[PDB]
Design a protein around this nucleic acid. Structure first.
Ligand SMILES: [Mg+2]
Ligand SMILES: [Mg+2]
Lengths: 287, 105, 106, 286, 288, 288
DNA sequence: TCGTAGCTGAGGCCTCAGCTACGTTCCGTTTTAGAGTCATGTTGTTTAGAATGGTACCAAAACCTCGG
DNA sequence: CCGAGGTTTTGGTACCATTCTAAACAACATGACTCTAAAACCTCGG
DNA sequence: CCGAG
DNA sequence: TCGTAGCTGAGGCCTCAGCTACGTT
């Protein structure tokens, strides 16, 4: 499925004949469920049925909930992403601490490389090389916090030395929003392979239930950074709309132009195979 | 790049079995996500040729073996050149190739 | 060769006496222009080149009945020939072929 | 945070007003203050609910559970900014020691065998009933001897004759299987409520509810009773008679309680014992 | 324009309805839109047809051919009024000067001879081909020296042997004659459409037959028929006949474009007429 | 070859049997031996006919004429292997001398003016009648002075008032036009029968008028229509129409005899043509 | 204020057989503007259909380890 | 030293979703022709 | 001038 | 044994609102 359905009108959502049924007072739309990739519920004026939700969960549709300010606040978490789900669990519980370290660190390296590539892209040839240096000094589970130093540098270079990444502004709001979209994509994909998302590689179960998704999405963060950077002078509502480009656009991955959700599926499946010690090379994503 | 599958029918109604056969087939069409363009005339958006071959297969499986039922494959581009001599264009989401949709906005 | 097909589909209202008359006129037009009934409410016209096609489109706007839903689709003979008959018999009328030579009898 | 587990299984509309959950059915109406709610459990597919309600449920970090058309759970809401306390249970469950699982599982199976015997007794098979009690006394951790399986085969043969196996296609097995599924769903639901995953069980087949199967074991005879009493009937009748499980009351911890309520208490305590927060598995008998 | 050749040889009733030709036989029934039809060929003597149909056939400018008991053609419908303003061209045609007719006629025959030669060349008779080109170079106005006739006799002997004359009763001549009649009819039709009388030929002008002018105009095209029958020289007449319909199916190079024969004949005719009218100089050229 | 002109204008079926043309209408039948027929004229669009019949008609070189929905001729069959004698007429017609055409045309128009006058007299306009006779006496070859036109204007104003023009959308003009078109068609048909082209008038030389020559010949007969329309000048058009068919029902004095109109038109036309051809002297006269 | 499956009868779409009524409305001539024809060629774009590359999964070859 | 058997690496077929690419195509370009209506002209007696 | 040819 | 134009009523196509019965309640 390939559509991102955005609902922000007072309406009743229901299910009939394999269709999502949208009823507003004005008009009415039927959308075939197999066509839908993501269902995004922006507003608090929407009714929906539990039948619909069941069927949404059956098809593997990412469902997002929002608050009063149209920021996302949660997602549906299926319990049983497969019929074979028991098998992967046992494997996941057996992931060795050394292999988790290898994989996690491999992944963070890709993130830093992509942060650098993005800096290069904005004609900061110099600070870009600096990040590559921080990357070369990485050791397992990054005890030195090279990731965090790389990030602080990266963000100061992009948005000036006045900028923290904890300050209340349109730029951070945008970044956060985009990052949540990504989170949701990978949370879905993980569950679909039979893994628990609560169990992260570096911190399992630490202050949140989606640690493993956060770990996997790391290399993709710059995709959102790019978009926000390009709209850094815009209002938040525009930033938000521009961010949906993530689902419309295609990106180079394994020599092919692929849609982001499809990349995330392949990426996740292979990361999981490597953690399971069924194969070696961690897959690479570069911007 | 997207395809459209255009399906047209004239199906008999005389007998009870003819009628049942029809109701079943139409039900299948709706459930497969075909859209009524006109009465007896339905269209289905498809992604790739893989999906198309697959649908054609499902169609043979649920062939009602009555009346005249014809299929035409065409590119989304071809379909988009459709001329509305009269009546309003169909702006239902299901009829568009848009990846991002908004029920509202 | 250069041939194309114009596929015309309609759903036209019948409530009123005038919109029935409007229909009968339009259908008459179609038959007289050499459209052939593929199915009820669905008609096709074989055309030699694009020049002829533009001309027919023009005639169609001229005889627009201004009722119901009436819709046109252009396609190459080659495309039309790929039509799949899921069921029912193919249309072997001469009017539905491209053949430059025809024998009636023989 | 709150203390109520709100269960909805009637065709209904849920909404939000003035810090209350608003429940409207054609029969009944209820307002429930949000701060009172710990868990919202949506058992059926006949419920409407609003996104406002959902937002506010997420604000409070109320555990919201969804079920399918059989009333098995299929998902939950995952907040991006916090956690229901149910999240802590997963860590605990992963830490369940193999010994403790053995103790609890074996305790449980014993209860099942006891109840199988009591049922045989009930049908004036005084003799085979004692036989089962004997098999029970010989039980060791994780039942390596397969006393469970021997007991069961004996039990079923006695009830339905020596020509009967539990793998044969007939009305009796269909009825048993159906009834067992009802039970399964009750315990599946209760487990997820406590924060456990139902997939991997205490012993041992990739089923998604192994742990639920383990917990329901002592209750199986409740179904057995009903099917036995209607063993000559058609399947559609068997099916309808089985709904007595939800209507009737059963003795449990010295009081007559409804089955769903028993299952809640039973499950919560079994989990506490597996977590080593309590000693002494709870007991259920016919 | 119109592009179908409709051949009728079954006991049948032809009629007209709603701009269609209506064909009814005991078994089968066909409707054919009139604008699609180029030629209607009535092969047999077992056909009924209505005068409405004939009117409408004449309106659309459809070549209608009548046949014998042996399926040979014997006549054509000759419209009286081939165009909106036919009076105008007629006056112009009457004013064609004898010199201009000579120039045009002789130009035309030269093209025929060239095409006869090209056809010979095509069959690896390099030598006799050059011979014809020589006869052509010797041509004077209205060909007082049969050069045309000398060229033709040579041409035919070299193709079908020195035993062959074009008057002897055989399958080859029958085929040639049939093909030549098809051509005649095409140009007869085109002339009448431009507003000319076909009776008034450039050289003999109505002395013998009523289509002299058509015969004159078709001259360069004769080898097209010659080619087809040469290639099927050994075949039976019924096959020769069917192969000849290729003339309507095929396309030929004319004025840098590949065009259908009926369309060529239209342009060719119109331009010949313009030159006769002295509205332009330079006869159009058709070569095989 | 034969002598009969067979005119078909009834819904009917034509066929061939036993060397006879077979005419079948719902009313009656006729068989006519083919050797007796000179011309077959098909006036209407309600006729079926067989290809056998057409073959046999072409064998005999019977002139076959086709007409449209208004009974004007539109074509003829052209045999590939012979000629009806009507073919010889074209040559003759092309040779008509300018003087002879002038004589004949002016003679004819004189007859028209006389008949216009006689009609005025008939309506007790003694005075304007004499006026027209005066215009007639002043006529020179091809009427350069336009005596015809001035006569007509006077004639019509007298009959329908000075407020009347021929271009105003009256029932009267509609009726006149209709009647005139009947007449036109009669003479168009007779002319093509003799082998003439109707496009080539004596004086009518309009590029768009496909029937200039017919308009010339019908001139003396116009008042026949004028009479009828005048007598019904106060009636509705549908009645005017119906009353006009009297032209075909009634008899008129012609060459000392009471004859039907179509028959008169045949004799009249044949003779006019003979005098143009210089095969006889003395235009035939028709007076009302 | 949930879904599915199935059938029925009301009412709108669509065609067709069958009926009635109707059936020649210019003729001084030439010019011009305009709407309606037409079949070919030319040009970059689109498309159907098969190749590709990165998979899985499973017989092969080659590789190995004794025992005659 | 042979090959029996068995254990391993190797290379093969069968599968997808993209991508490629020879072929088909749409849309415009060309250079005409046909028919119609309306409007222009003719002479010259009211 | 109109308006018939 | 010819066509058109116009309308009507019979009868087949096509959809839909509305009904019944069912569903590990
Ligand atoms: Mg249909
Ligand atoms: Mg329709």
């Amino acid at each position: 499925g390939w559509r991102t359905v955005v609902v922000n009108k007072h309406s009743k959502l229901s299910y009939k004949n394999n269709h999502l049924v949208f009823k507003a007072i004005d008009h009415q739309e039927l959308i075939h469920l197999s066509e839908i990739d993501v269902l995004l519920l922006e507003t608090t004026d929407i009714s929906l049925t539990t039948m619909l939700l069941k069927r949404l969960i059956d098809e593997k549709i990412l469902v997002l909930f929002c608050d009063d300010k149209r920021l996302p606040i949660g997602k549906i978490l299926p319990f049983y992403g497969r019929h074979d789900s028991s098998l992967q669990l046992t494997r996941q519980l057996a992931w060795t601490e050394e292999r988790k370290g290898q994989v996690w660190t491999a992944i963070i390296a890709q993130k830093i490389t992509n942060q650098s590539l993005h800096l290069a892209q904005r004609d900061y040839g110099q600070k870009a090389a600096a990040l590559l240096a921080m990357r070369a000094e990485l050791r397992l589970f990054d005890p030195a916090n090279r990731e965090g130093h790389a990030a602080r540098s990266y963000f100061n270079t992009l948005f000036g030395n006045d900028f923290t990444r904890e300050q209340e502004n349109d730029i951070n709001a945008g970044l956060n929003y985009g990052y949540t979209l990504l989170l949701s994509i990978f949370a879905r994909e993980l569950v679909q392979t039979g893994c628990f998302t609560q169990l992260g590689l570096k911190h399992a179960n630490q202050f949140n239930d989606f640690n493993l998704a956060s770990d996997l999405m790391e290399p993709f963060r710059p995709l959102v950074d790019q978009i926000i950077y390009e709209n850094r002078k815009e209002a938040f509502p525009i930033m938000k709309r521009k961010l949906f480009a993530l689902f419309m656009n295609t990106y180079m991955y394994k020599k092919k132009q692929m849609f982001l959700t499809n990349i995330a599926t392949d990426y996740t499946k292979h990361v999981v195979k490597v953690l399971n010690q069924e194969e070696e090379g961690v897959p690479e994503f570069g911007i | 790049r997207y395809m459209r599958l255009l399906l047209m029918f004239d199906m008999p109604t005389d007998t009870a079995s003819d009628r049942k056969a029809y109701r079943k087939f139409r039900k299948f069409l709706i459930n497969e996500g075909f859209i009524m363009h006109q009465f007896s005339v339905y269209s289905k958006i498809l992604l790739n040729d893989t999906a198309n071959k697959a649908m054609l297969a499902r169609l043979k499986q649920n062939n009602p073996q009555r009346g005249l039922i014809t299929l035409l494959n065409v590119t989304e581009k071809q379909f988009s050149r459709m001329i509305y001599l009269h009546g309003e264009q169909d702006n239902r989401v299901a009829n568009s190739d848009e990846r991002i949709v908004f029920l509202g906005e």
